[PDB]
Amino acid sequence: FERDISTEIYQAGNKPCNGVAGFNCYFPLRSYGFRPTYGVGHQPYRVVV
Amino acid sequence: FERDISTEIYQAGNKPCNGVAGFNCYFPLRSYGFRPTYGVGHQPYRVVV
């Protein structure tokens, strides 16, 4: 039960990756993939708590 | 362990509805579509309890 909205790149090496990524540091956000041509187990559901 | 039969029209409100369609009254039955295009999502199975 906490919120986190961060666009800063999370480093995964030794050099400080404040704004440079591509060699050894990864972006912490990735996109979803929802195609109708996918399987039944790869379909998006609109879930509410 | 109670065998039951259902053909009558189900209602989702306090209005009188025994066989009336074209409204919020929903048919409580639906037809299974057994096709080879649904590998996991919809497939017949030989299940016996």
Curated annotation (Swiss-Prot), chains A, B:
<feature type="region of interest" description="Disordered">
    <location>
        <begin position="1"/>
        <end position="27"/>
    </location>
</feature>
<comment type="subunit">
    <text>Binds to host ACE2. RBD also interacts with the N-linked glycan on 'Asn-90' of ACE2. Cleavage of S generates a polybasic C-terminal sequence on S1 that binds to host Neuropilin-1 (NRP1) and Neuropilin-2 (NRP2) receptors. Interacts with host integrin alpha-5/beta-1 (ITGA5:ITGB1) and with ACE2 in complex with integrin alpha-5/beta-1 (ITGA5:ITGB1). May interact via cytoplasmic c-terminus with M protein. May interact (via N-terminus) with host bilirubin and biliverdin, thereby preventing antibody binding to the SARS-CoV-2 spike NTD via an allosteric mechanism.</text>
</comment>
<feature type="region of interest" description="Receptor-binding motif; binding to human ACE2">
    <location>
        <begin position="1"/>
        <end position="45"/>
    </location>
</feature>
<protein>
    <recommendedName>
        <fullName>Spike protein S1</fullName>
    </recommendedName>
</protein>
<feature type="disulfide bond">
    <location>
        <begin position="17"/>
        <end position="25"/>
    </location>
</feature>
<comment type="function">
    <text>Attaches the virion to the cell membrane by interacting with host receptor, initiating the infection. The major receptor is host ACE2. When S2/S2' has been cleaved, binding to the receptor triggers direct fusion at the cell membrane. When S2/S2' has not been cleaved, binding to the receptor results in internalization of the virus by endocytosis using host TFRC and GRM2 and leading to fusion of the virion membrane with the host endosomal membrane. Alternatively, may use NRP1/NRP2 and integrin as entry receptors.</text>
</comment>
